[PDB]
Write a protein that binds this ligand. Structure first.
Ligand SMILES: *[C@@H]1O[C@H](CO)[C@@H](O[C@@H]2O[C@H](CO)[C@@H](O[C@@H]3O[C@H](CO[C@H]4O[C@H](CO)[C@@H](O)[C@H](O)[C@@H]4O[C@@H]4O[C@H](CO)[C@@H](O)[C@H](O)[C@H]4NC(C)=O)[C@@H](O)[C@H](O)[C@@H]3O)[C@H](O)[C@H]2NC(C)=O)[C@H](O[C@H]2O[C@@H](C)[C@@H](O)[C@@H](O)[C@@H]2O)[C@H]1NC(C)=O
Ligand SMILES: *[C@@H]1O[C@H](CO)[C@@H](O[C@@H]2O[C@H](CO)[C@@H](O[C@@H]3O[C@H](CO)[C@@H](O)[C@H](O)[C@@H]3O)[C@H](O)[C@H]2NC(C)=O)[C@H](O)[C@H]1NC(C)=O
Ligand SMILES: *[C@@H]1O[C@H](CO)[C@@H](O)[C@H](O)[C@H]1NC(C)=O
Ligand SMILES: *[C@H]1O[C@H](CO)[C@@H](O)[C@H](O)[C@H]1F
Length: 602
């Protein structure tokens, strides 16, 4: 007879109910499982009724794969899932946090902290639009973004994934969501999930909640603060995500007053679902439930019980799916977890899939392949990079002539530094590899390349990664552009207590600047000790992690556009002042939040 859930002209809620009512326990728990592509097989997917797959940092078909290669991979997995008794399409997720960054050739946009310095939510929205297209260009339909954490301690290795230390700024940047999913209708109810269609992707507000508030910025640690600050600082942005229809929400590895988020039923179910009225689905983080216990995974049985009863709907296993499914099944069979919990979880996952049209368009669109790395997207990225630059100094003294903008026509100029010609460094974490990488790992333009592409034909451009003082003094340079900074990092590998840039760095700047007037470009994912660098430089620009379009940097250095970016964080004088955020008690910043020198286009 007629099958309601397969009828596209029917309301989403009716389709969810109809399908849910035909599912076996195995099929229900299957929808709740998300596995890594590395352990997926047509059989595994079909036999276990897997509801979702993901690609972790660096998890790719093969180095340098094309958009078609990705599309074929995703489609392959989808066909297996479509072959099940109910034919429920799987939703493939990935970390497209500053472009479709795992993919070779994808446009790499500036990381969040930089986007916060632009104070342009519309720009960010546009970035989200370009990003969805490039993700769909690879056949993926779900992006684990935006990370709306409010980093309150720069020592956190994920601070660069935070728009600001000021919730107000982070709230405004939730505009990435409508960019990724598309704008919600005017009638729209806050809390409901939404995705315009096959040319958009499901978004993910992460990490619920207070991930940007761990002590000493220690990742995945404990966030000690009253519900007053929790709700005043780290919660706001989520309410905005609810109003903009964010499809999913990922839970943080961190704890709140000693309680693991992945086990906090009060927050996940009591607040996020019951209070905020979130209707989409709640997903876990990579082995998030394993880490509920300590040692991690030392009681997976407990992990499944706590997490599921806490309110999570989909678990990012992402490897031992057999163990996960076996255990969750046992708990249900034993009454430890009620069918209502399972039904609710499956209701939310299906709601999201139906809403985004997954049942209508389960497969990738070849026509979308060209979206990957499309020049327009790169131009957009270029604009964002330019706008994210924060000029901190532009002259050694009040009477010095401002060094920036530099002249495009000069007899001979020096470009130097470890970061002057290193595309990987310039992109930072979450680029090709999980931890990011060094060198030419994808398509883009380094600062050196951008310089050469900007100067007048007559301007001789010399490159020296680490020239000594004499080399500079004898080179007859008119000026020099020196780029230095942090190395790529992600999550815990990024935790840093001293926050000083690696060498050679300061030394190169001092050597170069000692010999000729210099413009130092600082590449970092957060504010770092900068008095020494400042002392030696004539002009110093905070470029954060620009992305693949380095010309965004030269667009400002040479005056095609004036600097407009403003510090989205507090620049400290010393690390032992930390934490220290705007509105604090002893606020004694080297540069207060909102600071930024300007220039006008020549
Ligand atoms: C402040 O505290 C942080 C850590 O909390 C410290 O930086 C970390 O230092 C760790 C060791 O002390 C280091 O861990 C080791 O890493 C070795 C390999 O490290 C290279 O490769 C990784 C990526 O694979 C990069 O992230 C590293 O930065 C490093 O990269 C090379 O760095 C050199 C020097 O600038 C450069 O010339 C190379 O071109 C560059 N190559 C690459 C890959 O790009 C590994 O073999 C060890 O087993 C061990 O795991 C950890 O990676 C690093 N954290 C990061 C992400 O930077 C700060 O500074 C230290 O930096 C290291 C590199 C070294 O210079 C130390 O002398 C510095 O103290 C701390 N600052 C201070 C003042 O203590
Ligand atoms: C926040 O981070 C701190 C680390 O600074 C966590 O505390 C630390 O916990 C680890 C283990 O959980 C302890 O290390 C050692 O682990 C081995 C494991 O085999 C064990 O054999 C040793 O006896 C020892 O426990 C470490 O001592 C401890 N350090 C601190 C800070 O006291 C803390 O648990 C984290 N908070 C949360 C819940 O996120
Ligand atoms: C120069 O830049 C400032 C701020 O960046 C701006 O307010 C001002 O209008 C600009 N001047 C001109 C003439 O465009
Ligand atoms: C855990 O893993 C997921 C998927 O790779 C990331 O999106 C989270 O930020 C990380 F904490």
């Amino acid at each position: 007879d007629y099958v309601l859930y397969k009828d596209a002209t029917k309301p989403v809620e009716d389709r969810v109910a109809d399908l849910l009512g035909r599912m076996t326990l195995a099929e229900k728990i299957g929808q709740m499982t998300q596995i890594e592509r590395l352990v997926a097989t047509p059989d595994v997917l079909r036999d276990n009724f897997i509801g979702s797959l993901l690609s972790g940092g660096g998890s790719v078909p093969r180095k340098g794969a094309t958009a078609k290669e990705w599309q074929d991979m995703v489609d392959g997995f989808q066909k297996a899932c479509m072959s099940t008794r109910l034919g429920i399409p799987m939703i493939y997720g990935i970390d497209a946090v500053h472009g479709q960054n795992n993919v070779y050739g994808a446009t790499i946009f500036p990381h969040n902290v930089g986007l916060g310095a632009t104070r342009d939510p519309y720009l960010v929205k546009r970035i989200g639009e370009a990003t969805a297209l490039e993700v769909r260009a690879t056949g993926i339909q779900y992006a684990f973004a935006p990370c709306i954490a409010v980093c309150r301690d720069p020592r956190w290795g994920r601070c660069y994934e935070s728009y600001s230390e000021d919730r107000r700024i982070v709230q405004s940047m939730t505009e990435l969501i409508p960019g990724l999913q598309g704008d919600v209708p005017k009638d729209f109810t806050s809390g409901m999930p939404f995705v315009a269609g096959k040319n958009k992707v499901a978004a993910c507000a992460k990490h619920f909640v207070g991930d940007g508030g761990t002590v000493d910025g220690i990742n995945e640690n404990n966030t000690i603060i009253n519900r007053e600050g929790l709700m005043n600082i780290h919660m706001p942005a989520y309410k905005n995500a609810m109003d903009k229809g964010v499809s999913t929400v990922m839970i943080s590895y961190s704890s709140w007053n000693g309680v693991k988020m992945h086990a906090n039923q009060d927050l996940v179910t009591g607040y996020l679902k019951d209070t905020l009225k979130f209707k989409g689905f709640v997903i876990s983080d990579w082995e998030g439930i394993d880490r509920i216990t300590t040692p991690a995974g030392s009681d997976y049985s407990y992990s499944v019980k706590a997490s599921i009863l806490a309110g999570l709907d989909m678990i990012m296993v992402p490897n031992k799916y057999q163990q996960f499914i076996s255990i969750l099944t046992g708990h249900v069979n034993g009454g430890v977890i009620p069918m209502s919990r399972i039904d609710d979880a499956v209701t939310r996952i299906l709601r999201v899939k139906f809403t985004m049209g997954l049942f209508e368009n389960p497969y990738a669109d070849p026509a979308m392949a060209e979206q990957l790395g499309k020049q327009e997207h790169r131009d957009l990225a270029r604009e964002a990079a330019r706008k994210s630059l924060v000029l901190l100094k532009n002259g050694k003294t009040s009477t010095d002539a401002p060094l920036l903008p530099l002249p495009k026509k000069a007899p001979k100029i020096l470009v130097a530094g470890s970061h002057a010609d290193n595309l990987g460094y310039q992109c930072g974490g979450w680029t090709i590899e999980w931890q990011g990488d060094t060198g030419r790992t994808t398509v883009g333009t380094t600062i050196l390349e951008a310089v050469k592409a900007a100067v007048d034909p007559s301007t001789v451009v010399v490159f020296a990664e680490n020239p000594d003082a004499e080399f500079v003094k004898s080179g007859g340079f008119s000026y020099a552009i020196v780029a230095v900074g942090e190395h790529p990092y992600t999550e815990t590998k990024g935790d840093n207590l001293n926050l000083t840039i690696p060498e050679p760095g300061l030394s190169t700047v001092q050597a170069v600047c000692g010999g000729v007037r210099c413009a130092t470009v600082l590449i970092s994912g957060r504010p770092v000790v900068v008095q020494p660098l400042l002392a030696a430089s004539d002009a110093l620009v905070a470029a954060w992690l620009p992305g693949s379009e380095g010309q965004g940097v030269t667009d400002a250095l040479f005056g095609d556009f004036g600097f407009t970016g403003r510090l989205p964080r507090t620049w400290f004088k010393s690390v032992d002042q930390l934490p220290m955020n705007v509105g604090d008690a002893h606020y004694d910043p080297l540069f207060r939040l909102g600071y930024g020198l300007t220039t006008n286009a020549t």
